[PDB]
Design a protein around this ligand. Structure first.
Ligand SMILES: [Zn+2]
Ligand SMILES: [Zn+2]
Length: 41
């Protein structure tokens, strides 16, 4: 139930990640995620 410590069930109970999409949720890159991607923001 608790993902490592927070509590969300779909938050990977190991590193608390994978919130939405595997790429950058906007650029489609794997090197970085959605919080580490500018893409003309
Ligand atoms: Zn959580
Ligand atoms: Zn990106």
């Amino acid at each position: 139930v608790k993902c490592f410590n927070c509590g969300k069930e779909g938050h990977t109970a190991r590193n608390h990640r994978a919130p939405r999409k595997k790429g950058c949720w906007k650029c489609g890159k794997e090197g970085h995620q959605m919080k580490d991607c500018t893409e003309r923001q």
